[PDB]
Amino acid sequence: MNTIAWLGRLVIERIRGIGVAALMLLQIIFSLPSAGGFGRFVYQMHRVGVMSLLIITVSGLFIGLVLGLQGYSILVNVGSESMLGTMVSLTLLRELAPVVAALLFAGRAGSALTAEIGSMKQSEQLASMEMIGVDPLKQIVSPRLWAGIVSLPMLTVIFAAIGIVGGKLVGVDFLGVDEGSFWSGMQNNVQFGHDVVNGIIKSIVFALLCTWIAVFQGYACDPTPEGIATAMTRTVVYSSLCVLGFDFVLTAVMFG
Amino acid sequence: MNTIAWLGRLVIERIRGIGVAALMLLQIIFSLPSAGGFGRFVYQMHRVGVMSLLIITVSGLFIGLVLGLQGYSILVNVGSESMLGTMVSLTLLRELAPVVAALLFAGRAGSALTAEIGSMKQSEQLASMEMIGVDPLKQIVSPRLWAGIVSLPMLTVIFAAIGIVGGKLVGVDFLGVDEGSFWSGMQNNVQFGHDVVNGIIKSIVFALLCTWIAVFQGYACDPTPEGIATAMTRTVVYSSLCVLGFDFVLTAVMFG
Amino acid sequence: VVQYLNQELVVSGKIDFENAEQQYQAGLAIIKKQTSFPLIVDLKQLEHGNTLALAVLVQWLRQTPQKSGLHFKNVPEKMLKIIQACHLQEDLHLV
Amino acid sequence: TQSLIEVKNLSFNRGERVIYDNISLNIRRGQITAIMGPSGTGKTTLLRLIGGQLVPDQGEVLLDGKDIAQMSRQELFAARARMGMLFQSGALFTDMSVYENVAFPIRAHTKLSENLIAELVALKLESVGLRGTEQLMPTELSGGMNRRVALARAIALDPDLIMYDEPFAGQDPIVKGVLTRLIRSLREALDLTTIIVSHDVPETLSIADYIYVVAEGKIQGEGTPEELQAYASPFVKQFLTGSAEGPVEYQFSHQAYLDNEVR
Amino acid sequence: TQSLIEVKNLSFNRGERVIYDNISLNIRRGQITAIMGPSGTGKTTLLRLIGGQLVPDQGEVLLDGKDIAQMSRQELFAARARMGMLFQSGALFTDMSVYENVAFPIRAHTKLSENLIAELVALKLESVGLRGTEQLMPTELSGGMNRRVALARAIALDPDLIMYDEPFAGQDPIVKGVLTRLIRSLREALDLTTIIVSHDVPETLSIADYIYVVAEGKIQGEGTPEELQAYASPFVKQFLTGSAEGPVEYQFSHQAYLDNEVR
């Protein structure tokens, strides 16, 4: 019954392991703004945001083309492909831009954030900064958090826009429908305050759980650089269980 | 015109960077089998396969439930939801089991493989093994490759099966359709040798590009453990550009 | 205010980077009318020394014209340990 | 004379570890107060206890009478302006320039004009001997030059309590012989108080003023290096010379060998 | 006497790094042939050139007449059974047991029965003094005990050319004083040929038989340690003692300081 105790003692640790991480989050946002933090923040958004822009643009196409391929192959025998502009749009607006752009963001900037803080604990820059009294939560962590909350909804919008344009490319330029019909049905079904703004509220509360779980495992990792690499693959599991799990609920709600 | 030269010399390096990696691949598979490699291999499949089993099972549900939620919300006003058993199945068989199970596999075992070999180069176990003459390509790499080719098609099958069962759960137990029309509307439309076996041929040639790009960046990384963590996020970008890009080039072949 | 007249500049008190910049300002404004350089530098009434207290003196030398602008005396030997530590004993002048 | 730090009877233990069960130290002014120990002790943790970065549990860390867990938050920041430390491997920020490394504790502490803040760095960079920099990064600095910038950040403003976590890392005998003379001179010139935690005996006693030695929870001897070797137990005496006679195991077990078999 | 290794006139340079531009060495039998250098040289790369793990470009590495880039693939594996090396930090496989570490070069080399393969490990683990193991892992081994097992792995079966990449890592003076006596005894008992690349002068000359010294591409002196200090240029003489007089820069620049300004 001893391996039972090992499993029992492991998930007891994972619960406490959460209760630390919530206390670190409330200690960040409930603080006065540091002097000249904006110049730190904009450089941080240049690291997390602008670097990840290429890998989501060209991944914006290949999700769009397969939606523009199976979306055509399904709709031809039913004949009613006045829904091609609507069955490219409503999936890409409601689910695949919140979901798939999260699992690609947890990949690049979700995991490169927990390395950069994982490297800073080991060489003890974070320890040396504390003895000068600059308290590295406000110095290193907090611009690396606010460049993740802001920069993900600025990405799913760029994901959903290049996705829909991609569905129009292989649709009407290589297979052929009535572009008019397309645009028509497209704008004649998709509300703005019900669909797009609900497509961003999902992409904010994904950006919180995908970064706060990421910036935590870099801070509360250990040294001994098998201790970095066990943590950079501890986020990417723990993000994708909480991206998709938190999607369901949200969707069901904003879509009774 | 100097930043032009920096961009120019960067992608010149990335091409050569590929031509090394193809030579490492042909040097692995064209070799005699090592003595007692099977006992190494089965322990390796324990590491890559069996560990990743949990994160794809419970991620198998949440893809299934949202397909069982939007698949119901679309099909109710058209009324003809004899396609619910067919529009859960044909997407999950053709695209989302090859695609989404790759981006979750590149996450966990795609990136934990390039760390374990990234750690072995830095402490020079791989260098010490060469002086004893055991040539670590056949010792460390080759069981860590064949436990990735075999273990991914054994996962998308488990992904697609728990996905379809998940669509049946919120479909007929919480919303309610004919339990007869589900499978009888399913089994008739879905051929085996045209759809499932084509749903595995895509999941083999995804397992090759997702592991051979992963096991390469661990081997040909550098030391200085900012050299591990720059490489564990060099696969997860380079996998997901080549999962989705090779998907769309394939689905036009089998479903033209 | 603790940098006086009589063609000489006397530094008293302590230099501790809150009362060190208006010491640099008020020393600078005295310099702007002290042309042709007959002036002597006094620092005898310091009670503490650091590189900070040294650093304002070279800025006074840097604002003035040519290399041997200020001339130094009443150096209280806590400076003198520092000056050879930054190796300056001919780079600024003395007796 | 008067003590900088009174360490008195702490038991900062880490769960399983018992480390520093009951110990008490005296660090007085103007004097090199070296500390030797075995690897895998809390020596570089002990400096954080002096620094108050780590928190003690039962003892008291008296910075000139006041304990450093009793002062308020606005006194803590004022207290750290007398003490700056050295991180074993050197702690440089690999994003800010080397001009931005050494100017950083000034801007983190005080507001001055730019013609003075750029002035103090050009002096403290000369006092280590690396002055033609302030332009290149912490990258492309050789590891020998790496600690010297970290030394300059350790003498940023002008503290009077600098703690060294192994200045002699195992570098060249050049850079070892460089930092031998760098350490005394600054202590002479600026009247500081240094502590060196090293394992490098022929350099350590020849340069220190007092050597406490911590093994696991106890002082095994103290004084100047002359009455260390006089009043030496044959556990600390063998720690000085590294002989295989004493209470250290060179053999892992004690058995006839010819008892069990080979599977 | 007869040379194990003739290093002769290689220029194994790394792209821009012209490391080892033209050098030539003699390693003869039965003798401790130490090598000192500055950090950031190719010293631990030089051992791979002797080992043939790295490949030379212009020279020749003569293992008893035969060059180690001319032999066939079935001779290369036979040639490595005379030489085993130590990787600076100790190279243990952290998945196989400590019984599986030391038995590994035997099973990688030869087939024997289990009552002999389990027998040689229980002897070579006693020759380092760590015999009550073979059950625990390379984990929970203290760093002091870590290189020992490595020592065994080295003197695994029974080679006659072991290369040491810094045995004195900066550990305790205990473990430093332990490995001082471990090195000679095995060379006496098993008639080996060792090379030690270290920066630890009062241990190095007191234990070596011959010291070549590589700075950047050149021998700055050789012989026994008596005629190193006699025929010493004031670049290698200052390398021995670490004086700040010689052609090493302690000052980074020579600018008359008083020239530019502070921005």
Ligand SMILES: Nc1ncnc2c1ncn2[C@@H]1O[C@H](COP(=O)(O)OP(=O)(O)OP(=O)(O)O)[C@@H](O)[C@H]1O
């Ligand atoms: N945050 C922590 N607080 C206290 N102990 C820790 C912590 N993290 C790890 N430890 C354990 O305590 C020991 C810390 O000792 P540490 O290595 O820091 O001191 P040291 O041996 O003096 O270091 P140095 O190599 O600088 O001499 C380690 O063995 C480690 O197992």
Ligand SMILES: Nc1ncnc2c1ncn2[C@@H]1O[C@H](COP(=O)(O)OP(=O)(O)OP(=O)(O)O)[C@@H](O)[C@H]1O
């Ligand atoms: N694969 C390689 N081959 C040759 N040179 C390399 C390689 N990788 C890196 N280098 C460069 O060459 C140098 C290698 O020297 P290395 O540090 O290995 O020898 P060393 O300084 O003698 O090491 P030690 O710390 O063991 O004394 C490094 O400065 C590095 O910049």
